[PDB]
């Protein structure tokens, strides 16, 4: 006689730019999952810190401090948990998930519903079978 609802996908939502910010938390909430809004890539393994997260999206378009170092602290953290890097135009954005090494992909800024869609299905499914066994 009750409900026990917990949202189950709990999503990291973090952007470099409050209008990409809004549009990805929105996209994020039409799918139905729990959107964690951050603003900064250290605010992402900061938000990591403080409260349990599945998918890490965190979209850097400033080549001008982070987009790189973020995913060195995300690794000496110990990632257990698969880091998104959404970037735009950061030189070699690649290279910097390379050298930091704690990332896991890297994206583009324009993450439509679609793309993002795809890309929370594909990593719900690898999501559950790193944390199942």
Partial sequence: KAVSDNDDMMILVVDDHPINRRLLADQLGSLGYQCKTANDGVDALNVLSKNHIDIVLSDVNMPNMDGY???????????????????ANALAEEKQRCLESG?????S????????????????????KSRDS
């Fill in 69 to 87: 170092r973020l995913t060195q602290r995300i690794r000496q953290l110990g990632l257990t948990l698969p880091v998104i890097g959404v970037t």
């Fill in 103 to 107: 990332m896991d992909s890297c994206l």
């Fill in 109 to 128: 800024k324009p993450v439509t519903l679609d793309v993002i869609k795809q890309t929370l299905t594909l990593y719900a499914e690898r999501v559950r």
